[PDB]
Amino acid sequence: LPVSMTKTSVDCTMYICGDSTECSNLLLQYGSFCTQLKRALTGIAVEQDKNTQEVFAQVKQIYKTPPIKYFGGFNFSQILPDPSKPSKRSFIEDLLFNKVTLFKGLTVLPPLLTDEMIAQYTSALLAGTITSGWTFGAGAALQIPFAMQMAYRFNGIGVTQNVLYENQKLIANQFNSAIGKIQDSLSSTASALGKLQDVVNHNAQALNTLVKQLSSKFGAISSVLNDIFSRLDPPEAEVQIDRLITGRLQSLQTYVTQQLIRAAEIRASANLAATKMSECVLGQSKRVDFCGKGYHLMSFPQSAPHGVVFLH
Amino acid sequence: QKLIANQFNSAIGKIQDSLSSTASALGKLQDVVNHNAQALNTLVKQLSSKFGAISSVLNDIFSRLDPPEAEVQIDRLITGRLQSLQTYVTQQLIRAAEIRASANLAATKMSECVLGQSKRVDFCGKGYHLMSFPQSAPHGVVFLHVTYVPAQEKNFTTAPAICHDGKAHFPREGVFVSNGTHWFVTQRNFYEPQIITTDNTFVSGNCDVVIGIVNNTVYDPLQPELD
Amino acid sequence: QIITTDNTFVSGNCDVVIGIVNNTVYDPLQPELD
Amino acid sequence: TGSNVFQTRAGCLIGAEYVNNSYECDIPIGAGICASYQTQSIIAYTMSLGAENSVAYSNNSIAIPTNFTISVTTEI
Numbered sequence: 210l211p212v213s214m215t216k217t218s219v220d221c222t223m224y225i226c227g228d229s230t231e232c233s234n235l236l237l238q239y240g241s242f243c244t245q246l247k248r249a250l251t252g253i254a255v256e257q258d259k260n261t262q263e264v265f266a267q268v269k270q271i272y273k274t275p276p277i278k279y280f281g282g283f284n285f286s287q288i289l290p291d292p293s294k295p296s297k298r299s300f301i302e303d304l305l306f307n308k309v310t311l312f313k314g315l316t317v318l319p320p321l322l323t324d325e326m327i328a329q330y331t332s333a334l335l336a337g338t339i340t341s342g343w344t345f346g347a348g349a350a351l352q353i354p355f356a357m358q359m360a361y362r363f364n365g366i367g368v369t370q371n372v373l374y375e376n377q378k379l380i381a382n383q384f385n386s387a388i389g390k391i392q393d394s395l396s397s398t399a400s401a402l403g404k405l406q407d408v409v410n411h412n413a414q415a416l417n418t419l420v421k422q423l424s425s426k427f428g429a430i431s432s433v434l435n436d437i438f439s440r441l442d443p444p445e446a447e448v449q450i451d452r453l454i455t456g457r458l459q460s461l462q463t464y465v466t467q468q469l470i471r472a473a474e475i476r477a478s479a480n481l482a483a484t485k486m487s488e489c490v491l492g493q494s495k496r497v498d499f500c501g502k503g504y505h506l507m508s509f510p511q512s513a514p515h516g517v518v519f520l521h
Numbered sequence: 522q523k524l525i526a527n528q529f530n531s532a533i534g535k536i537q538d539s540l541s542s543t544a545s546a547l548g549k550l551q552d553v554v555n556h557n558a559q560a561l562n563t564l565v566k567q568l569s570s571k572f573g574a575i576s577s578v579l580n581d582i583f584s585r586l587d588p589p590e591a592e593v594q595i596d597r598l599i600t601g602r603l604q605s606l607q608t609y610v611t612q613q614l615i616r617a618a619e620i621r622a623s624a625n626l627a628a629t630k631m632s633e634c635v636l637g638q639s640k641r642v643d644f645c646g647k648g649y650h651l652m653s654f655p656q657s658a659p660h661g662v663v664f665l666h667v668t669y670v671p672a673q674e675k676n677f678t679t680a681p682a683i684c685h686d687g688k689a690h691f692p693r694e695g696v697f698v699s700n701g702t703h704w705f706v707t708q709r710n711f712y713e714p715q716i717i718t719t720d721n722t723f724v725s726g727n728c729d730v731v732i733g734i735v736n737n738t739v740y741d742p743l744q745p746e747l748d
Numbered sequence: 749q750i751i752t753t754d755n756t757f758v759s760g761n762c763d764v765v766i767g768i769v770n771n772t773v774y775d776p777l778q779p780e781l782d
Numbered sequence: 783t784g785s786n787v788f789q790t791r792a793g794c795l796i797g798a799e800y801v802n803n804s805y806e807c808d809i810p811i812g813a814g815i816c817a818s819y820q821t822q823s824i825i826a827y828t829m830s831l832g833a834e835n836s837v838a839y840s841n842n843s844i845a846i847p848t849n850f851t852i853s854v855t856t857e858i
C-alpha cells in the first residue's frame with residue numbers, strides 16, 4: 210500500500226522566465242497566482258509527512274528484540290533487522306528497497322522521516338508483536354511466550370488452542386517455509402511492487418511533462434524569451450510574452466491540480482494502510498479478507514521506500 | 522463499581538480541563554475554517570489582478586480606451602477571472618471530497634462506537650473500547666472514547682498445559698500462573714487466580730506430545746463426595 | 749469427541765426439531781455413582 | 783547572518799547550533815533534523831522516536847495486569 214509521494218516545490222519566476230530579468234517584472238502584473246500553488250504544494254508535502262507519521266508512528270516506545278532469538282521454533286530472521294549491514298534492514302526489506310528504483314525550478318524536498326527511522330519503527334512494531342501480542346497496542350506491553358500468543362490467536366478463529374501444542378513443530382516448520390517462499394516470490398515476481406513503481410513513475414512523468422511543456426511555443430514565433438526580447442521591439446513583444454506566460458501558468462496550474470488529486474488518492478491509501486496496521490499488526494481482525502485471505506492470525510509490517518508491505 | 526465510577530468521573534473532569542486549557546485541541550475544525558476563509562480571501566484578492574491590462578477597473582479602461590482597443594483588455598480580464606473562479610471551484614470540489622470522506626469516517630465511528638462496542642484496536646480510541654459519547658461541534662463531531670487500559674502488571678511463570686493422571690489439561694478460558702510455587706488459573710486481562718479444577722480446564726491428549734507441560738494436581742469437585 | 753452432558757445442553761423435546769436423530773448421551777457422573 | 787552554519791540533507795541551517803543529544807521534534811526541518819528553542823537559542827537535533835525499552839521475553843514467563851484505569855479520550 211503506498212503511503213507518501215515525493216515532496217515537490219516549484220520556483221515561479223525561473224519556471225516562467227528561466228532566469229530572465231525583463232519578464233520577471235511583467236509576471237508581477239499577474240498578481241498572487243502562485244502564492245496559491247506554493248501553498249498547495251507545501252500543504253501536499255506536510256500531508257505526506259503526516260501520512261508517514263500516522264502510518265509508522267503508532268507505537269510510543271521503541272521495543273527491542275531480546276538477544277536470545279528463540280520463539281518456539283519460529284524463525285523471524287527474514288523479517289527481523291540485520292545487525293551486520295549498516296542499513297540495519299531485514300532481508301525482505303533489503304529486497305523490497307532493491308527491487309524499486311527511481312534544474313528549471315523543480316526540486317524535490319526530502320522526507321522528514323528517513324529510511325533508517327522508518328526501519329527502526331518497523332523493528333519496534335515487530336518486536337512488540339513477537340514479544341507481547343495484542344497487549345502493546347492496548348496499553349502496557351505484557352510479556353508472553355510466542356507459542357502462547359499463537360495459541361491465543363488460534364482461539365480467535367474458532368480453533369481450540371490444543372491444536373497448536375499438539376502440532377507446534379509442524380506449524381513452526383510451515384511458517385518458516387512460507388516466510389522463505391515470500392523471498393523467492395518477491396525476487397522472481399516482475400511486478401510484485403507494481404503500485405510503488407506506478408506512484409514513482411507517475412511523479413517522474415508529471416515532472417518530465419511539466420519540464421517538457423516549456424519547449425512548446427504556444428503559437429509564438431519562438432519559445433525562447435531571450436530571443437523575443439532581443440530581436441523584437443516591446444510593442445509587439447508584450448503580447449507574445451504575455452501569451453507564453455499564460456500558457457506556462459496554465460500548465461503549472463494543471464500540474465498542481467493533478468498533484469492535489471494524486472495526494473488525495475495517496476492520503477486515502479495511507480489511511481487504509483494505517484487502519485490495516487492497527488487491526489492486523491497491533492491486533493487480530495475478524496473482518497473477512499481484510500488482513501489477507503483466510504482466517505487472520507497475525508500480520509508483520511515491512512518498510513518500503515514509499516509505502517508499506519504487510520506479511521499477513 | 523465505586524472505583525470505576527470515580528475514575529470515569531475524574532477522567533471526564535480531566536477532559537473538561539484539557540479542553541479548557543489546551544491551546545489547539547480543536548485544530549481539525551479550525552483548519553477547515555481557515556482553509557475556507559483563505560480560499561474566499563484569495564478569490565477576492567485575485568479580483569484586483571491586472572491580468573496584463575492597463576487597469577483592473579473596468580470603468581477606467583472603458584473611459585481611457587476606445588471600444589476596439591478596450592475589447593481586448595476586457596477579454597483578458599474576463600478570461601483571467603473566469604479561470605480564477607474555476608480554480609476556486611475545483612479547490613472547493615477537492616475540499617468537499619475530503620470532507621465527505623471525513624464525514625463517512627465520522628458516521629462509521631458513530632455507528633461502531635456509540636451505538637455498539639467495536640472490537641477494532643484503534644477505531645474507538647486506544648485500548649479496549651467500552652463506549653463512546655458524541656458531542657456536537659460547529660463543523661464536526663467530537664467523540665469521547667471510553668477505553669479500558671490495564672495497569673500494574675506483575676510477572677508470573679506459566680506453562681502451556683498441566684499434566685495430571687497422565688493426561689494434559691488446558692485452560693478453558695483462563696491462563697496458568699505459578700505464583701512461584703502454587704499453580705492457579707487466571708483470566709487473560711485481569712489477575713483473578715483460581716484453583717485448577719476440571720470445571721475450568723479441558724483434557725485432550727497425553728502429556729508427552731505437549732511441549733513445556735508441567736506437573737500439577739487438578740481438583741475434582743465431586744471427589745470429596747466419596748459416600 | 750463422545751457426546752456427553754458437558755458439551756451439550758437440553759432445550760425442549762425431540763418432536764419440535766426437524767432432522768433430529770436418536771443417539772445416546774453419556775453422563776460422566778452416571779458411572780461414578782456418588 | 784553567518785554566525786553559525788550546519789550541513790543537512792535538506793540544505794544547511796544558519797543561525798542554529800547543532801546538539802549531540804535528541805529531543806522530540808518541535809519544528810521539523812527534514813532528513814530527521816528538527817529545531818527547537820531551549821535554554822536561550824535555536825538548536826538543531828535529530829528527532830527522537832521515543833523511549834527504548836526491551837521486554838523481558840522468556841520461554842515460561844507471562845505478565846498479567848493487577849489493576850486497570852478506564853481512561854477516556856477525545857477525538858475530533
Ligand SMILES: *[C@@H]1O[C@H](CO)[C@@H](O)[C@H](O)[C@H]1NC(C)=O
Binds near residue numbers: 284285286287389
Ligand atoms: C532462519 O532462516 C534462515 C534462512 O533460511 C537461516 O539462515 C537461519 O539459520 C534460520 N534460523 C534458525 C534459527 O534456524
Ligand SMILES: *[C@@H]1O[C@H](CO)[C@@H](O)[C@H](O)[C@H]1NC(C)=O
Binds near residue numbers: 700
Ligand atoms: C504464593 O507464593 C508465596 C511465596 O512463594 C506464598 O507465600 C503463597 O502462599 C503463595 N500463594 C498461595 C495461595 O499459596
Ligand SMILES: *[C@@H]1O[C@H](CO)[C@@H](O)[C@H](O)[C@H]1NC(C)=O
Binds near residue numbers: 732734735842
Ligand atoms: C520452557 O518452559 C516450560 C514450562 O516452564 C518448561 O517445561 C520447558 O522445559 C522450558 N524450556 C526451555 C528450553 O527453557
Ligand SMILES: *[C@@H]1O[C@H](CO)[C@@H](O)[C@H](O)[C@H]1NC(C)=O
Binds near residue numbers: 684734735736
Ligand atoms: C510428572 O509426574 C510423572 C509421574 O506422576 C513422571 O513420570 C513425570 O516424569 C513427571 N514430569 C516431570 C516434568 O517431572
Ligand SMILES: *[C@@H]1O[C@H](CO)[C@@H](O)[C@H](O)[C@H]1NC(C)=O
Binds near residue numbers: 769770
Ligand atoms: C427414537 O426413540 C424413541 C424412543 O425409543 C422412539 O419413539 C422414536 O420413534 C425414535 N426415533 C427414530 C427416528 O427412530
Ligand SMILES: *[C@@H]1O[C@H](CO)[C@@H](O)[C@H](O)[C@H]1NC(C)=O
Binds near residue numbers: 800801802
Ligand atoms: C557526538 O558524540 C559522538 C560520540 O561521542 C562523537 O563521535 C561526535 O564527534 C559528537 N559530535 C558532536 C557534534 O559533538
